[PDB]
Design an enzyme around this catalytic site. Structure first.
Site, PDB file in Angstrom:
ATOM      1  N   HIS A  12       0.816  -1.248   0.000  1.00 18.94           N
ATOM      2  CA  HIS A  12       0.000   0.000   0.000  1.00 18.94           C
ATOM      3  C   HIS A  12       0.835   1.277   0.000  1.00 18.94           C
ATOM      4  O   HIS A  12       0.218   2.331   0.121  1.00 18.94           O
ATOM      5  CB  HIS A  12      -0.962   0.057   1.199  1.00 18.94           C
ATOM      6  CG  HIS A  12      -1.958  -1.045   1.238  1.00 18.94           C
ATOM      7  ND1 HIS A  12      -3.046  -1.100   0.402  1.00 18.94           N
ATOM      8  CD2 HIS A  12      -2.040  -2.126   2.037  1.00 18.94           C
ATOM      9  CE1 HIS A  12      -3.754  -2.182   0.678  1.00 18.94           C
ATOM     10  NE2 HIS A  12      -3.161  -2.823   1.679  1.00 18.94           N
ATOM     11  N   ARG A  20       0.803   7.432 -13.051  1.00 20.05           N
ATOM     12  CA  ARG A  20      -0.173   6.649 -12.244  1.00 20.05           C
ATOM     13  C   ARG A  20      -1.275   6.154 -13.195  1.00 20.05           C
ATOM     14  O   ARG A  20      -2.468   6.304 -12.871  1.00 20.05           O
ATOM     15  CB  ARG A  20      -0.662   7.520 -11.082  1.00 20.05           C
ATOM     16  CG  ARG A  20       0.431   7.892 -10.089  1.00 20.05           C
ATOM     17  CD  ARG A  20       0.316   9.246  -9.419  1.00 20.05           C
ATOM     18  NE  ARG A  20      -0.917   9.361  -8.673  1.00 20.05           N
ATOM     19  CZ  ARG A  20      -1.243  10.336  -7.829  1.00 20.05           C
ATOM     20  NH1 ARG A  20      -0.412  11.344  -7.598  1.00 20.05           N
ATOM     21  NH2 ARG A  20      -2.424  10.295  -7.226  1.00 20.05           N
ATOM     22  N   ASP A  21      -0.867   5.596 -14.338  1.00 21.32           N
ATOM     23  CA  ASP A  21      -1.762   5.091 -15.419  1.00 21.32           C
ATOM     24  C   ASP A  21      -2.018   3.587 -15.236  1.00 21.32           C
ATOM     25  O   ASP A  21      -1.451   2.984 -14.297  1.00 21.32           O
ATOM     26  CB  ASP A  21      -1.166   5.431 -16.792  1.00 21.32           C
ATOM     27  CG  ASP A  21       0.198   4.817 -17.068  1.00 21.32           C
ATOM     28  OD1 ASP A  21       0.853   4.334 -16.101  1.00 21.32           O
ATOM     29  OD2 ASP A  21       0.594   4.819 -18.249  1.00 21.32           O
ATOM     30  N   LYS A  39      -5.504  -9.667  -7.137  1.00 20.96           N
ATOM     31  CA  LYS A  39      -6.207  -8.777  -6.174  1.00 20.96           C
ATOM     32  C   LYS A  39      -7.246  -7.938  -6.933  1.00 20.96           C
ATOM     33  O   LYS A  39      -6.913  -7.428  -8.010  1.00 20.96           O
ATOM     34  CB  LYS A  39      -5.182  -7.877  -5.477  1.00 20.96           C
ATOM     35  CG  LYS A  39      -5.560  -7.431  -4.074  1.00 20.96           C
ATOM     36  CD  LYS A  39      -4.634  -7.980  -3.009  1.00 20.96           C
ATOM     37  CE  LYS A  39      -4.586  -7.123  -1.763  1.00 20.96           C
ATOM     38  NZ  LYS A  39      -4.300  -5.705  -2.080  1.00 20.96           N
ATOM     39  N   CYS A  80      -6.035   0.695  -7.985  1.00 18.08           N
ATOM     40  CA  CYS A  80      -5.934  -0.279  -9.104  1.00 18.08           C
ATOM     41  C   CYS A  80      -7.110  -1.269  -9.040  1.00 18.08           C
ATOM     42  O   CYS A  80      -7.207  -2.037  -8.064  1.00 18.08           O
ATOM     43  CB  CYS A  80      -4.573  -0.974  -9.114  1.00 18.08           C
ATOM     44  SG  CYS A  80      -3.176   0.189  -9.102  1.00 18.08           S
ATOM     45  N   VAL A 102      -6.806   9.029   4.362  1.00 13.09           N
ATOM     46  CA  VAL A 102      -6.714   7.546   4.285  1.00 13.09           C
ATOM     47  C   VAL A 102      -7.234   6.973   5.609  1.00 13.09           C
ATOM     48  O   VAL A 102      -7.090   7.638   6.659  1.00 13.09           O
ATOM     49  CB  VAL A 102      -5.296   7.045   3.920  1.00 13.09           C
ATOM     50  CG1 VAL A 102      -4.760   7.694   2.660  1.00 13.09           C
ATOM     51  CG2 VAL A 102      -4.282   7.222   5.027  1.00 13.09           C
ATOM     52  N   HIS A 113      -2.768  -2.093   8.227  1.00 13.15           N
ATOM     53  CA  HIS A 113      -3.960  -2.397   7.392  1.00 13.15           C
ATOM     54  C   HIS A 113      -4.574  -1.109   6.830  1.00 13.15           C
ATOM     55  O   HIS A 113      -4.708  -0.149   7.603  1.00 13.15           O
ATOM     56  CB  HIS A 113      -4.974  -3.196   8.207  1.00 13.15           C
ATOM     57  CG  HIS A 113      -6.323  -3.293   7.582  1.00 13.15           C
ATOM     58  ND1 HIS A 113      -6.566  -4.050   6.442  1.00 13.15           N
ATOM     59  CD2 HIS A 113      -7.504  -2.753   7.943  1.00 13.15           C
ATOM     60  CE1 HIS A 113      -7.839  -3.952   6.124  1.00 13.15           C
ATOM     61  NE2 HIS A 113      -8.433  -3.157   7.024  1.00 13.15           N
TER      62      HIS A 113
END
Ligand SMILES: [N]
Ligand SMILES: [Pt+2]
EC number: 3.1.27.-
Length: 121
Positions: A12, A20-21, A39, A80, A102, A113
């Site tokens: 993470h 960031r494509d 994932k 993603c 976040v 986590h």
């Protein structure tokens, strides 16, 4: 032990991704070993590792729901999302670049986590 902290970072944290494509998501998910199986959704936080740890203490966080913490600062993030399909490689990913606070779980003043629900949307 800090194994859950360094595991949170592998899964993470991406310091400065440049682009960031879709291709970036497809690349990083492979590098971080989140493609066996594919994932379904994974989010990377960008910027300073200092400010992400600081979420665990009142300086940069508040209590959130039952066990969690939400950041006071906003973070450059990339989500993603799996296209198709198959839970097995090759995994194609769609990149959504965001900027917001976040939600993490903390232990020994370290995040261990990421709550992905705020990035499903
Ligand atoms: N996580
Ligand atoms: Pt987790």
């Amino acid at each position: 032990d800090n194994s859950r902290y360094t595991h949170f970072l592998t899964q993470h944290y991406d310091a400065k991704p440049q682009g960031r494509d879709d291709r970036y998501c497809e690349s990083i998910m492979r590098r971080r070993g989140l493609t066996s199986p594919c994932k379904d959704i994974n989010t990377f936080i960008h910027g300073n590792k200092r400010s992400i740890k600081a979420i665990c203490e009142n300086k940069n966080g508040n209590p959130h729901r039952e066990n969690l913490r939400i950041s006071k600062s906003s973070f450059q993030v990339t989500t993603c999302k799996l296209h198709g399909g198959s839970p097995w490689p090759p995994c194609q990913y769609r990149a959504t670049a965001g900027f917001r606070n976040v939600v993490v779980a903390c232990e020994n003043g370290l995040p261990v986590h990421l709550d992905q629900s705020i990035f499903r949307r």
